[PDB]
Every structure is written in C-alpha cells, then in structure tokens.
Amino acid sequence: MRSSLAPGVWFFRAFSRDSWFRGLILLLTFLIYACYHMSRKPISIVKSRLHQNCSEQIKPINDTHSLNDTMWCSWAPFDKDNYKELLGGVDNAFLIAYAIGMFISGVFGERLPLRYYLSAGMLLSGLFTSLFGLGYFWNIHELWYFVVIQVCNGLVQTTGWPSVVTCVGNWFGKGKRGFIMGIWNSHTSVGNILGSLIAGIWVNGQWGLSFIVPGIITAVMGVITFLFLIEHPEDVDCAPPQHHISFFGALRIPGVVEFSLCLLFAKLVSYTFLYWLPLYIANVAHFSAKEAGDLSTLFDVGGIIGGIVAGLVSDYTNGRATTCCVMLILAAPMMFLYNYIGQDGIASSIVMLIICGGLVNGPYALITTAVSADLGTHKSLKGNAKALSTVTAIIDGTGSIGAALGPLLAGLISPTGWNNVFYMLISADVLACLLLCRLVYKEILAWKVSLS
C-alpha cells in the first residue's frame, strides 16, 4: 500500500477516450501524406545522373565505347544537347495528369468508400513509381516508355489529398486552426526531407533502386492504412465535432478573378525549387549527386520553420493575409543574394537555404485558408454550399496549372544560363504579392476598430 502510481501512467491516464481517437488519426494521416511526398520526390534527385560529364569520368575497363563516343556516361534518350528540354517534359507529364486528376476526383471521388479508395491509391501509386525504376534493369531506351509511366502515375496519385481532408474534417469539422494543426501541415515537407535522404543512397551506382525502395514503402503504408482507418467518429462511437452552369456568373464575383492568378504565381515559385534545385546545386557547386541531394534538404528544414512561425503569428494577429505579403515581398532580395554570393563558402549557403526556404514555402500553406476565409462572407452566403464548392473548385483548379507551368518554363530557360531562371522566380513573387488590392485593404481597414 506504499507504492503509488508511476509518473508515466499517471500522465497517460489524464487524457479522455475521445482524445486518443482524435489523436491517432493525426498520426495515421501524417504518415500517409508524408509517404506520398516521399514517392513523388526521386525524379528530381536523379537528374544529375541520367546525363553527366565524361571529362571528369574515368575511362572504362570494359570496352563499351568507340574512342570518340562520350555518350557512354549518359543514359540513352537524355544524351544530346537537349538534356534539359527533353526532361522538362517528363517533369510535367506527371503534373498535367495530376491536374486533370484533381478535377476528375471532384466527381467520382465521394462515390467510393474512403478506406477502399485511399488504400487502392497507395498501392497503385507504389506500383507505377517502381515501374519507372525497373527501366534500369530491363535497360529500356525509349522516351515513350518513361512518359506513359508518368502519365499514369499522375492520374493515380491524385487520390491522396481529397481523402485526407475528408478524413480529418469528419473528426474536426471544416477548418480547425491551432498549434497542433500547425505541426500537422509539415507532413508535406517531412516527406521531401526524407525522400531525398532515402533515395540519395543508390544514386551513384545502380539508380534503379532509387525508385524501387520508395515504391515499396508506399505499398506497405497502403496496407497499414487498410488495416487501421476510421472515417466517421460514429463508427467507434466517440463524440462528433462541435459545429460552428453557374461558371459564367462566378467570374462576375469580385473574388476569384484575382486569387486564381495568385495561386498560379505562388506555386510556380515553390515547384521550380522542388524539382530543379538538386540539378542547380550540382551544376554550380560541381558536386556529385549525393552531395546535391543532401544539400537540398536544408531548403525543406527552413520550409518547416516558415510554416510554424507564420502560423503562430497569424494567430496572435487577427487576419492571415498581411503576414503573407511580408514574406512574399521579402523573399525576393534573399533569393537574389543567394544567387549572388551564395555558392562559394558553405557557411553562407547553410544560412541562405534555410532563409529562402522559410520565406518561400511558408505562405504556401497559408494563402489558401486566407482566401477561403474571405470567400465565406459574400452576398452568395455560407448557406449556398454548392456555390462555395464551385468557386473553390476554380481556385484550386488553376493552382494546379501553376504546377505544370513551373518546370516546363524552367526547362526551356535553363540552357540559356541559370541567372535568367532566378530573374523569372524573383518576378513571380512580386507578381504574386498583388493580393493586397483586396485582402490587405480589408484587414488594415478593420484595425482602426482597435482605436475604438
């Protein structure tokens, strides 16, 4: 009768029954959509391996050249002078089929059960990623094989996000916001920050195992999701969350017509860093393809902090739009200085990657809730759920056209120098920071009430 309860189980018994079921559904859907971004990454890390320089390459013992070849280093379709323009098509042959997939998944998406539709997405997303890596063993040398695998990997892998938002919205109720779901939104950057560390291993050597291993980890987390997913909280009998064509008319609203071209510009800037940075940092600093991949991750370790800090500060100050304009208008001088003096001493680049990763990938997770907060208050009121569904089908529609216009435009300027790429990416942030004609003009208008 002398020994009391231990501190561990006395801590663990404080939490209610509901607060464990709304607590493991964050740990499930964290590791689901992190494993999606781990799958999408290694096409962007192996680009400095499919074409390379035979001058620094040692001569082979096995005679596979004809003494004037210099094409036995390169993989075979990516061999000529256009190794940057024939690869910028393979980069968005995934993204165009992804942008069509997000639009079709707004029709045939709710008509299937969620656990049978998310787990058959993570299995056919781990199949088609690895058929891209089995091209190394079957030594297929054709451009028309590596594209159809991408156009079918883009159309399958769109089952990830519109299932995760419903699985969390059934437990928490359409737009929670706090410190916990500020941590949960780093699930799309943890995926990139360990999709480069895992895939990087096999690069120098047999690169076919850079696509097979993240094509099997996604296939196993497609089984774990099939065994342990709970859609609606009435299943385990927990508590429900506590509650709170017309297209031509939709262009007449003073809303969408200036935010559709603000999600187009924002994602340009983020996705060209997602894809073409492990080739830039290998081409300028003259590293290998393991030192190019592992150095990039310091962009994402700033992308985490830029999502935490801008989420807290926009909760201390009411209105989540005036803290996006500051970071967008401040990102441009930092990436100009990073192109200016950021590739000689590593103490400069380890600072500059983290700063231009905080300032670019920060507001990316914030401007969507910022604009959806404004479009809730209109003459077309909150009761018209179909009207808000259609006018938020448009914004996230052109948001994914800004995806496909990123690396396609980056893979045609890049043979004319890298500096012209950063002029475009600096001009795009200032063209994207023109949301202030509406949201900032309303938010500073409502701060004079602090005088009263």
Add this chain to the structure above:
Amino acid sequence: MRSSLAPGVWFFRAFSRDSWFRGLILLLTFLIYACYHMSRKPISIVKSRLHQNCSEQIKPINDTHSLNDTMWCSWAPFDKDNYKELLGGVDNAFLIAYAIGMFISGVFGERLPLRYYLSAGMLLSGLFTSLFGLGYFWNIHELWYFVVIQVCNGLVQTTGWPSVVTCVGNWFGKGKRGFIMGIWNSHTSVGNILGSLIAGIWVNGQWGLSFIVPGIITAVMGVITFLFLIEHPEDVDCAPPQHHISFFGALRIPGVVEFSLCLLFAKLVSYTFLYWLPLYIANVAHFSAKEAGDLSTLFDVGGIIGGIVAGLVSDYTNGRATTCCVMLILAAPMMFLYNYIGQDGIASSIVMLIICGGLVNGPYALITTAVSADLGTHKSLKGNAKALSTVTAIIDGTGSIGAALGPLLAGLISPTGWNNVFYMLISADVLACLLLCRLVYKEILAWKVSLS
C-alpha cells in the same frame, strides 16, 4: 453509412480492459530481465581478446616492444601462462557476490517499494558494468581493480529476479503455466542471444566499448521501468487474479536433501557453457573474436526451442519430471559427439550447437517448478507458508553455489586440455539425472491409474 469497421480495430476491440493490463506487464518484465542478461554477457565474449597469440599478429609500426617481448598483444595482468586461471577467478568474483546477494535479498528485499528497488537496481547495474569498460581508456593495469568492480556488480545485480517474480505474481497469482508463460521464459535467452551480437561489434579494436554500450542500454531501461511499472492490480483497478531455527528439522524431510544436490549439478553444466564457450570455439576452430561470439549464439537459439517444446510436452503429459530425465540422460551423447567430430565442417556444428542447446538449457527452466510442485504436498502442509519459504530458500540457495563452482572448476582443468572439461560436463549430467529416485518413482506410480 457504407464503410464498416476495419479488420485491425475490430480485432483490437475484442480484448477486455483487464487483458491489456495483464498483457503489457509481460512486455515490460520481458525487456527488463532480458536487459539484465545482456549486461551480464560481454565478460564471456572478450576473453579471447585480453590474451592472444602474437605469432599470427602482424608486427607494429609504433615501437612498443623490445624485440623479445611478445606481450604487447596481451592485456597486462592476463599475460603469462596462467591466463586461464587468473580469469576463472574474475568470472566467479561476480557469481559469489551474486550468491550472497540472492540470500541477503530474502531479508531486506520486501522492505522496500518495488518500483524504487527495481529501478535503482538497473541504474547501479549499468554503472558498475561500464566501470569495467572504462579500464580500457584509463589503461589501468591491475588485477585488484577489475575484481572489486565485479564484486560490486554481483551484489547490485541481484535485485533483478526477486522483483520480477513478485511483479508477475501480483497479477497472475503464484505459478501460472501455459503457452504464454512458456514464451515468457525465453527472456533469459534472448538476452544472451543479443548480448553477443551487440557486444561483439567493438571487440576487434577498442574493446572498452564492448562494456559501455550494454552499460547504457540497461541504464535507459532503468528509466523506462521507473516511468511505467504497476505493482499490484488494485492500483489501476483491474481484477485481482483468481486464487487456487527450523533448519535442522528441514534436513530431516525426505525432500530437499536430494534436490539441493540436483540444482547444484544442473547449473554447473549450463553456466560453463555460458561463460567458457566463446573461448573454446575460438581456441579450437582458430577464428577471431567476432566469429567466436556470433557462432556461440546458435547454442541459445536451441535453448529457446528446448524451453518451448519441453514446456508443451509436460503439459500434454501430466507430471513435469519424466520429461526432464529424458533430456538430461540424452544430452550426454550429443555433447560427446560434438567434442568428437563437431569442429571440422560447419554443417555439422550448426546442427550440433542447436541440439546440445536444446538438450542442456531446456530442463533448466523446468526442474524448479517440477520440485516445487512436489514440495507443496507434505505433512508440513501448504498452510505453513514460512516452512515452504524456508525449504525453498535452501534449494535456490545451493542452486547459486552451483553457479560459482562452474567456471572456477572450468578454469583449472582447461590448461590440461579441453577434453577433460567435457568429461566433467558429461559426468555432471548423469550425476544430475539421479532425481529419478523420487519424482520418477512417484510419477510412473500414478500412471497405473490410467488403467483404471
């Protein structure tokens, strides 16, 4: 309303509230007493490193010899011809202080709370194990340092077992027996089978990190036990388990006087294999000290199977004594054949280690319950709890004198050849299989009732 419950959570919701609390207390006390046996092991794996042969050793670049030395391979007290007799004292300077510690812990043991007495045992058991390994960095060359560390590591590490049996006996109630606690009794062999794989790493080279790392893993599982230990099931309000000097007179009973000298012989045989086998297998097969340590584990992977099979078969057949005499009387020809033709072709030794590990370490976990079942039925009946406590203080008393007589006797015969060691270990099994004058004569007596 179409998606049902998943198979995973529908499986997990079948088990009652009590069956998780009596289910994690096996997973805690498995990893506690496995981490004790991981700590005790690496003195037995590094013995082929503290003294070695300079003939196969390459000559050093740094001049640390005087051209006739041949003692710069050896560690400094273990250098002369008696490197097997000065090490057999360090082997049981742990075990004598352990045998005194088990007897003192029958007096001052219940007078402390269990969670404060098991967690200060796994911390002062990870301190004094690692002070033996800090002798490599402080390069102390003295026999009188490595013994006092052992005589204080033996006296502390006796807090392990008489706390684990009370922590399980409060939940399950003095002697459960089934397939689950047949698996739980392999916790003393999983510790040896991963105390050789972990410690083996640093042997060839800096052997001081063969004692520091299992001196820190025990120190961390001394914290995990401090946070998550539950003694009595009235603490979390589960269900209680369902229930069922006099020393000179204790020698007059027809019991103890022939089982005290049966636990003395049984543990001799097991402990000389626990300690002196990674030196035998390095000395005969002429391996290194990583191939000697990793080959030994195939003894313990037979020690697991010999504990599972003899636990099931003694439940299919009533009476747990006639299945111990078979394995003890059959172990002797197999270890004779293992000394005869078991060190030339590895396909022979990989069979023979597993067979003489099943037949030797099998009944070790079974004869104690076999004798405690018989001593429950006597004229001194089950009500006299102090009488059974005293007459089971004697059997487990001399059980630990059989510990200290093992490696001490093995470290004085071993400079006269290894074959004379196996003659002693073959004679000890036949001298230990003379329990049949009492238990087998009673058990075959009660099988004629199967005729009626």
